Design a protein around this ligand. Structure first.
Ligand SMILES: *[C@@H]1O[C@H](CO)[C@@H](O[C@@H]2O[C@H](CO)[C@@H](O)[C@H](O)[C@H]2NC(C)=O)[C@H](O)[C@H]1NC(C)=O
Ligand SMILES: *[C@@H]1O[C@H](CO)[C@@H](O[C@@H]2O[C@H](CO)[C@@H](O)[C@H](O)[C@H]2NC(C)=O)[C@H](O)[C@H]1NC(C)=O
Ligand SMILES: *[C@@H]1O[C@H](CO)[C@@H](O[C@@H]2O[C@H](CO)[C@@H](O)[C@H](O)[C@H]2NC(C)=O)[C@H](O)[C@H]1NC(C)=O
Ligand SMILES: *[C@@H]1O[C@H](CO)[C@@H](O[C@@H]2O[C@H](CO)[C@@H](O)[C@H](O)[C@H]2NC(C)=O)[C@H](O)[C@H]1NC(C)=O
Ligand SMILES: *[C@@H]1O[C@H](CO)[C@@H](O[C@@H]2O[C@H](CO)[C@@H](O)[C@H](O)[C@H]2NC(C)=O)[C@H](O)[C@H]1NC(C)=O
Ligand SMILES: *[C@@H]1O[C@H](CO)[C@@H](O)[C@H](O)[C@H]1NC(C)=O
Ligand SMILES: *[C@@H]1O[C@H](CO)[C@@H](O)[C@H](O)[C@H]1NC(C)=O
Ligand SMILES: *[C@@H]1O[C@H](CO)[C@@H](O)[C@H](O)[C@H]1NC(C)=O
Ligand SMILES: *[C@@H]1O[C@H](CO)[C@@H](O)[C@H](O)[C@H]1NC(C)=O
Lengths: 211, 121, 319
């Protein structure tokens, strides 16, 4: 991508181009007369007689001073923009590279896992590694399972169902488990939860107590 | 009165251009080339307006973008904001990923600029 | 047009100055481009335009004042319509249109709400995955350290507290005109910058007359050159001042836009743990609304209510 798409690095190229233009402008404004007989200070000094030279020299001085003040003001504004970018880049390195971030779309789109910085002229390039969920399926769900009149909720997961059976999965990946007393917890009865469905919650120990 | 701007496909592709007059009741323009279209952004001459929306390429303004497409010529269109997606919302239905991918993307930020100093004398 | 008003003699004198037209026009062009960039970053965070089902079965939660109103000529929500109704060339000054019209902003906002309401944060991170609205809330409750039992057992109460809070927002925005003062202020400052530019134009600046045409009509050519030049210097200073002020103001707007974009990614396309970032209280979710020249966020937070005094201990000693 970086090799075939030259626009990829346009942000860094643009910083270079804007500063180059600010200097080229400063250089070219220098050759304007600004109301003087000549923009060349040496022409004024070589042919014009001293009291008249003073007048023409002063016209050039005013023009050149305005050119420099404009240049510096523009560099101060541009410098501020660069500083804001640098502060952001520094923040991102601390949070995306020296840790794992939960800030959405801060360290790239998707769930952030890790990042790796790379050096670039006048800047930093971050390669952001993220986890992206892929092919999904349509499952039936319920907020709780009704067992013996008690209401069972997942401890860490979502109750799902295929055409015939209820399972509990981790929220972000379809890895179904048998619904058991180790996977769910109980709170309240079956009358309070809206949309509660009937199922069997399995007690993993009862068989040993029975045997 | 208004400014005049030229909509240019890159010259490494073609030399056809379209010309936009920023504030004219498109009438009041002395140019030629037909394909005269009135938009909120000005008088656009040389681009063919179409009813097919697309992703924005060269923006004009007020919802209108232009591109070089089929042979090929400059066209004007309302920009699309993306494909539509109707989510199958239901009070008892959840979608769950059964697979994943790892994606690595690139983000670029400037840090510094050339340091200069100027001798005023 | 600002300085000479098509006077030939004035234009020829402008050529004796540096390339000031190029710099003034490029600076303003750069600002104009940035303004569309800011709008695009804040609102176009969704790649697809998500649409809602007919508005039904959201657990008892009522989103009708945030979602677009189908009966209007412009498909804006009741709150957006309120925000829009409440916020209020002779010298070469041209106002340019935005790339994204209010209608397109409304479509992006609608898509974000549709996503938030029917798929939670998954439309952000990956493909949108549908979820029952009450389960979305259950996860948002776990996200603040409160278990799921609370939401389901109190689902009716929660939906009613939510619905009432939204109605209160409309009354607040309607009755308190200062509520939108931030957006009104941006409008007012730019209007003043232009009015100042226009009025400085009529000052003499040391000239016999501020009207270039009076100088040209009665004053004899070599004297006209002197008086014209006095007006040129004054007008150039007026334009340089204007542009510098717009560059500074533009920077302030950009900082606000960057913050607004950050907030949408973190408050709308997710759940945030940053304190007082997405409103006071524990953040559950947020819903954006469009406004002239800006964005309004409705932030939904969980606030603990009546407490009791209990005795505590760090541990229990058993055997
Ligand atoms: C399965 O769901 C049904 C409701 O659809 C529950 O039936 C009720 O059970 C209580 C307690 O015995 C009775 O007082 C009600 O009269 C029953 N309702 C009806 C319509 O007959 C049933 O108990 C649930 N099964 C489980 C294991 O919880
Ligand atoms: C829902 O998932 C269950 C568990 O995988 C499926 O039931 C099993 O199907 C296999 C054959 O593929 C049998 O050998 C097992 O004995 C079944 N287990 C049980 C507990 O019955 C079930 O078929 C799936 N349902 C649907 C509609 O796809
Ligand atoms: C959401 O709340 C609004 C009120 O804020 C409900 O609006 C009512 O709609 C009916 C049918 O169009 C009208 O007859 C009533 O006069 C409206 N109420 C008011 C106060 O104007 C709206 O129906 C509710 N929607 C849902 C899905 O609950
Ligand atoms: C917790 O606070 C809520 C209010 O925020 C209480 O609900 C109100 O109760 C009164 C008295 O019955 C009703 O008139 C109101 O209409 C209820 N408000 C809503 C939005 O439903 C609730 O009873 C309090 N509860 C506890 C400690 O369980
Ligand atoms: C309840 O607290 C008392 C201390 O207030 C514990 O009493 C000590 O128990 C140990 C172990 O038997 C003895 O050696 C000490 O002499 C006891 N202290 C005193 C002052 O008599 C008591 O064990 C605690 N009960 C439980 C269940 O942990
Ligand atoms: C879920 O069901 C809807 C029914 O309209 C269908 O369009 C969609 O593709 C299904 N999703 C998956 C992941 O199978
Ligand atoms: C979903 O809606 C149907 C139709 O009104 C209703 O019978 C069912 O109980 C509802 N389920 C939940 C979980 O609310
Ligand atoms: C152009 O002028 C005609 C009247 O001659 C008017 O009806 C039309 O709306 C105007 N168009 C624009 C874009 O102003
Ligand atoms: C806790 O006790 C103090 C005793 O001074 C009292 O002032 C306070 O109101 C009590 N708090 C609650 C929640 O009952």
């Amino acid at each position: 991508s970086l090799s075939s798409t030259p626009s990829a690095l346009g942000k860094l190229q643009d910083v270079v181009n804007q500063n180059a233009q600010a200097l080229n402008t400063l250089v070219k404004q220098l050759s304007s007369n600004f109301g003087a007989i000549s923009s060349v200070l040496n022409d004024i000094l070589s042919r014009l007689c001293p009291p008249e030279a003073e007048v023409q020299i002063d016209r050039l001085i005013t023009g050149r001073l305005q050119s420099l003040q404009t240049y510096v003001t523009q560099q101060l504004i541009r410098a501020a923009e660069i500083r804001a970018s640098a502060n952001l880049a520094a923040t991102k390195m601390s949070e995306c590279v020296l840790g794992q971030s939960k800030r959405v779309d801060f360290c790239g789109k998707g769930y952030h896992l890790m990042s790796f910085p790379q050096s670039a002229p006048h800047g930093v390039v971050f390669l952001h590694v993220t986890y992206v969920p892929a092919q999904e399926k349509n499952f039936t769900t319920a907020p709780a399972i009704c067992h013996d009149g008690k209401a069972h909720f997942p401890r860490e997961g979502v109750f799902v169902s295929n055409g015939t059976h209820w399972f509990v999965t981790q929220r972000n990946f379809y890895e179904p488990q048998i619904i058991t007393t180790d996977n769910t917890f109980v709170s309240g009865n079956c009358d309070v939860v809206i949309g509660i469905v009937n199922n069997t919650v399995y007690d993993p120990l009862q068989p040993e107590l029975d045997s | 009165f208004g400014g005049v701007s030229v909509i240019t496909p890159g010259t490494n592709t073609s030399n056809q251009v379209a010309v936009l007059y920023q504030d004219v009741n498109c009438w009041r323009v002395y140019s030629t080339g037909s394909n005269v279209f009135q938009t909120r952004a000005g008088c656009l001459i040389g681009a063919e307006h179409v009813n097919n929306s697309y992703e924005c390429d060269i923006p004009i303004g007020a919802g209108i973008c232009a591109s070089y497409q089929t042979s090929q010529s400059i066209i004007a269109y309302t920009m699309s904001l993306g494909a539509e997606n109707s989510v199958a919302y239901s009070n008892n239905s959840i979608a769950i990923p059964t697979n994943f991918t790892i994606s690595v993307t690139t983000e670029i930020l400037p840090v510094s600029m050339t340091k200069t100093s100027v001798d005023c004398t | 047009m600002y300085i000479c008003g098509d006077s030939t003699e004035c234009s020829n004198l402008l050529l004796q100055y540096g390339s000031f037209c190029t710099q003034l026009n490029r600076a303003l062009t750069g600002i104009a481009v940035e303004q569309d960039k800011n709008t695009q970053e804040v609102f176009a965070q969704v790649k697809q335009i998500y649409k809602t089902p007919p508005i039904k079965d959201f657990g008892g939660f009522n989103f009708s004042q945030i979602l677009p109103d189908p009966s209007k000529p412009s498909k804006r929500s009741p709150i957006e319509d309120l925000l829009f109704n409440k916020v209020t060339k002779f010298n070469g000054l041209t106002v340019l249109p935005p790339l994204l019209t209010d209608e397109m902003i409304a479509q992006y906002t609608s898509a974000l709400l549709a996503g938030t309401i029917t798929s939670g944060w998954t439309f952000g991170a990956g493909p949108a995955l549908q979820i029952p609205f009450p389960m979305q809330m259950a996860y948002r409750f776990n996200g603040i350290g409160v278990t799921q039992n609370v939401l389901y057992e109190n689902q009716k109460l929660i939906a009613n507290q939510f619905n009432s809070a939204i109605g209160k927002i409309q009354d607040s925005l309607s009755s308190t005109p200062s509520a939108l003062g931030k957006l009104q202020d941006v409008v007012n400052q730019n209007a003043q910058a232009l009015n100042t530019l226009v009025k400085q134009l009529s000052s003499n600046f040391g000239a016999i007359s501020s009207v270039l045409n009076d100088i040209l009509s009665r004053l004899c050519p070599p004297e006209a050159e002197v008086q014209i030049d006095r007006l040129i210097t004054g007008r150039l200073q007026s334009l340089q001042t204007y542009v510098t002020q717009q560059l500074i103001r533009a920077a302030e707007i950009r900082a606000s836009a960057n913050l607004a974009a950050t907030k949408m990614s973190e408050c709308v396309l997710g759940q945030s743990k940053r304190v007082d970032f997405c409103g006071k209280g524990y953040h559950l979710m947020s819903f954006p609304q469009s406004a002239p020249h800006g964005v309004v966020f409705l932030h939904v937070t969980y606030v603990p209510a009546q407490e009791k005094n209990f005795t505590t201990a760090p541990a229990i000693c058993h055997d």
